[model samples]
Target: TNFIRQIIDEDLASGKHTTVHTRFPPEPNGYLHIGHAKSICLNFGIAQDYKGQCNLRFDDTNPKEDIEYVESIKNDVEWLGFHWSGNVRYSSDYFDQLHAYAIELINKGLAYVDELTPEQIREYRGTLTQPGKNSPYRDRSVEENLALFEKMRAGGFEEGKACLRAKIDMASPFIVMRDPVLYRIKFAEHHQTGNKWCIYPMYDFTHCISDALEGITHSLCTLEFQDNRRLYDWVLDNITIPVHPRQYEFSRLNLEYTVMSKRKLNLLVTDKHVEGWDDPRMPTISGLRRRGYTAASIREFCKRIGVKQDNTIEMASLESCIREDLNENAPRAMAVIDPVKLVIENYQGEGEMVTMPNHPNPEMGSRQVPFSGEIWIDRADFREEANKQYKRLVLGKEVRLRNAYVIKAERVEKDAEGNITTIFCTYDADTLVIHWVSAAHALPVEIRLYDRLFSVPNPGAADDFLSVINPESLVIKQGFAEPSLKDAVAGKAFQFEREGYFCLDSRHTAEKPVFNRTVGLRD
Candidate 1:
């Protein structure tokens, strides 16, 4: 809540609305992504804040809409931890009301039947810089318009031959206010309504009417609808609806390095560039879930980011929310993604279980991790030699094993290619807290280090978003996780100490355990 919350406060204080109500209408042509998550938080958050209710409505006007998407949308909203006010609503649920309202609009000289083709309508609608001229059929009488609309609904007119349009100002500065089409003929099978009618209502005309019919007080929309708010009020104002919902537009969540376009997301799926919408590398809500992002983390992010307008927030901000949530909750474990064998020269133990606190908070409990002379550390955590600033394992320098003894590197073994093969170390016995797992007792698990989906910050702004796809978005590593993680529950995230937070990937359809990194440890 930000400016929008303040406005709602005033409206409630002034008795404008006895009770507040909002609706999240996802026109599900495909999967709901993270962008939709933002809207869900805003609308549902508002509902909870105001002690009101929110409805989950599917804008099933378009034909390609699927039951798969509808169920997925509901699943996402549920996973986000929101409960809708009532039974679900569909745009087609108000088909009869929309038709009846279209008639009422025509009867009141607020709508008319037009024969202009799609191209002619667009030519007449005018661009942003110019004012649109009136349609030739703009002044069609109520009795005549009704009969034409009836013929249009019956099979007398072809798909684009005749249409019903709202009677708004042609010269209005907001181009969408310039006599927009309200209804058009479509012969395709209506999935939800079961082809009960041939003539269907368009989105602009349907959205406000649906909100009004449901007694919604607030119709929240993304910034794209800022201009459409005029038409939204116009239709509700002209109609005899008892309730008129005020529409508010806020910024859509635009995280850096990801495309929000449904078409682009669908392409990524259909083209097999990703495993599915639930792929950890993808930004779909299910994808985020599969990646080990929590509902609490998502909601915290929405609150931190706030309900503002028009800004591409850095990915770090979103990561910050998860980082804070995980820092306190995720159990700590050790996993070396890029492992290098380090042999302790003076150590006596073969392998021994060390008890480590699962989290800093004592109540969260503890786990057992086996430790031995031959332990694995990340390759990057060591160097042959470095200046005094280097605190990690290095030639002739000491480094501490995380929650274990400190050790000094004596010498390094190299292959014929001069690549480091192993490091010989001597235990001084005790803290640079580098993470490690006993090579002998480590459970080798597949660790997927997920990076940003796009290499560029603004992929949608680029000529080809696909061309900027990050090649290393998902990097597979044969990691050595502490043996305790062998029974790690799926989707239960654990902080992999210095590496990052990760969890068993939800799609454990595969035989072995694969961990998907939720986010980096530091940032």
Candidate 2:
């Protein structure tokens, strides 16, 4: 079991909490990525494990960027094969309660209204090596602060003209505890609660209280929030709430070769570096799904990666999980992505029906394939010369035509540019095997071969991550598959024999089949 499991075990054994309750509080600023998927699996998986509950709550404290993010999050969570506790939730739901709590803090002299500009607050918030200069308004009388806070809430202050800050140690080493601002004025309209309030609570103030209001037992979060935990406890300790949830921190998912920062992802989308968040090359959960990543594969990837201290994991590990899943679940099929025509000069008949196992497992049954006088094979499968271990076609060597007959290359027809346009071969009665598709029965498909989005393992480390983008990340090819693949259901994965595992494109239809290469056969 992981550290989180152990913590819950202790919590249950000691009766500190009679049951397990967790919440996934995501800020509705952007689409969820692979990193968030790890947290989702942990929270929801734990709920399933202990027969408890996990609520999906949107921390819509900052309404500026949250308009379109809520539904995408819910879709992503459900797509991952997990369900939330009830109707989706938002931090905006408890605006009234949060506002009353702020009043309670003011009445107790724990919070004060600050008139400092944002820049002034930052200047006073001193660096790690120094102590912060308390704001001039920090010592205002409780009655004065309460009245000012209410007036500020009544739209008396322009945006950024005033804010409410908790009364905490400014000399403490933890910068987050240095009398952090609890609420700030925003004149913009909120997605959920429009025009009702002009001031919004900061994440530090909103998260802990929301957890308490919902009766969350374990507020699990990433290590970045560890320092903020002191303030988390400070709020609950000072408040007279009936339930106080404890915060637990764990390392976040850091996959190599990709940037998971929401700011960076938004940059990618806004700057048109990527088509959108759902771009197949993107690491967004929606992107993965659109690119043919299955819910089972992603969940399995999360479980295999496990929870741990913050660390950068190899991208290969994630690929391996999907490869394993597709290998076992995907049906076998033949697709020549880089098509090279091969003519059987001596072969007779237009074509013949052929059958091959849909999967290595007999239980998956078999599907019909087709073969004819002319067929398409992978261009790389043939070479003028290669070592004996090549196990593919060569100019003078014989190779099996997959589920059909054996054929030996005779000669090649080249274009004026000396490119081999077609190869002539003679077929034997039968033998060996390799993947091939009959031209007469081929289902033409648009194949998208995707590779790493960035050339470097850690693009975020670069001065500009976009500079290291892999030029060859995606290669589109006009390919052909077996006739049966023409009717492939969208989102269904299939092993393209020697090529790789592929999935029917969700954005495109099977009638004019398009398949995205999910991952290569090997990591």
Candidate 3:
């Protein structure tokens, strides 16, 4: 499953690379999602395996790109426990080198400047089955092309008036090979480079040379770039560059029932369809983190899925993995989401105390909670009359109170709506044992129940996909947990017995406590 590792192994055996060097070149245009996490794991994983360096480089070419996204990306990677050198690099840093490389191509008569309008160029760039026609400016002399390029950089050329194109075959079947635009004239101010230069290089143009300039070896990326790999090598091979990094492609992570794209994610954030980028209902890395997903769990999922050239994993598989991880790490607690009052009529006045394990794994220790004459159980846990006599509370049925007394429902009361309002039960201190949070020790903890973010399988396919939006995607309840849970720190997670995995929210404090339910119990 470790496809990239296999390639790196061969490279090591052949002595092609002395020590592997990789790079995580993210275009920081938006927040990082789980799909990006795959690439991060692969690049950083390979470097760690080979005891080499993995540079965290930002391919910030467009001036419209935000630096805020860049910072968030770095934080996400670091939070996943990856460490990069203090020398973080950006594509803008190599503007001078790239400009010089462009001139070098020009002097060799391999690239030329095109004066055709953007639409005119595209019209000449034909389709797959047809050979593209060359522009009148394609035959411009090297001297003419160089002069025009300098003028374009010097702000003498209006936006869209001209562009520098690679002097590749115009009749090439692959469109990217059809003399793709090496650089475009844009007057917009760059986030990093500023308006000092009006010309900015294209991604296919800047990425390859940036790798060479940084001396990156064994460049790794997702499979979508297979078309661009030819362009990557074209730039490097056309020019005399040192320490070439061979580009390798691997499949990215795709989870069903969730969208991984930044575009749709932004739509959700902007349209108020979600709370924000980190909404637990969303699939962004921030979303998962806010949902109480642990770094160890995600890293383990990445390892379990392994590295492949291409693969699609079901959301359930990943969910199952998280459940397994939380089963061991998440402490055991009590929470009643759909609460129904249960009055212990025969029991004494005040509440009693009961001690329970914090986690099934006793190494996590235990906590003491109050148990009393009154308690709350899941509303669904009790029905007016049993379809048969369910093990839970019902008239004349005695079920253990989970660490407390065994009780028999003596009487039941309901509201006008026919919803069960309360139940009176007689308890025997000797026989029953059921999970409970003492009425006296009830901690008002807010719990959110999350379901699939979308109703349809793939929300990334189209914009109108909202038509299938899941109606019951979220259910929030004011839950009661043990007062001991007050000790649960924000971001610390635990499993509520008979419920699901939950993390204390950063918004939680002594005054107002809240938790985000991560996942539910396996069926």
RMSD for each model, in Å, please? 2.5, 2.1, 2.0
Per-model CA lDDT versus the true structure: 0.85, 0.85, 0.81
TM per model?
0.93, 0.94, 0.95
Please give the ranking of all candidate structures by lDDT, highest first, separated by commas. 2, 1, 3
Q: Candidate 2 residues 92-207, lDDT tens each?
A: 88898889998899989999999999999999999898779999899999999999998899999988889999998899999999999999998877867778889988888889
Poorly placed runs, candidate 1 (over 4 Å): 129-131, 270-272, 307-310, 428-432, 508-511
Candidate 1's residue-wise lDDT over 1-523, tens digit each? 4888888888888889887899898867777888888889988888987789999998877766646878878888998999999998888889899999899999999899999999999999987887788889999888999999999878689999999998888888898999999999988777776566888988888888999999998888988898989999888888898988999888877788889897778888887778888998888889988888899998888876664345678888888888888888888888888998899988885766767997877887777778788988899899887888877877878767877888988988999998789989898643316898898887878988888888898888778858889887877888787778877788888888878888898775244678989998774
lDDT by residue (tens digit), candidate 3, 1-523: 4666777788788888788788898777778888888888888877787788889888777775655888898889889888775487888899998999999999999899998999999989998977798889888898999999999999999889999999888787578989899889888888676778899889888989988877788888777898788888888888888877889887767788887776566777887777888888887788889888878778887876663334557788778878888888888888788777888778876865776777765777777678888888877777668766376766777677666667787988989998888888887756533456666668877877888988777766746646766777777789787787887887888888888898876644675588888988895
Model 1 residue 41 lDDT?
Answer: 90
Q: Between which residue pairs do clashes occur in model 3?
A: 251-309, 401-434, 402-433, 402-434, 402-435, 403-433, 403-434, 406-432
Clashes of 1: 2
Model 2, position 234: C-alpha lDDT score = 96
Question: Between the candidate structures 1 and 2, which one is better when assessed by TM-score?
Answer: 2
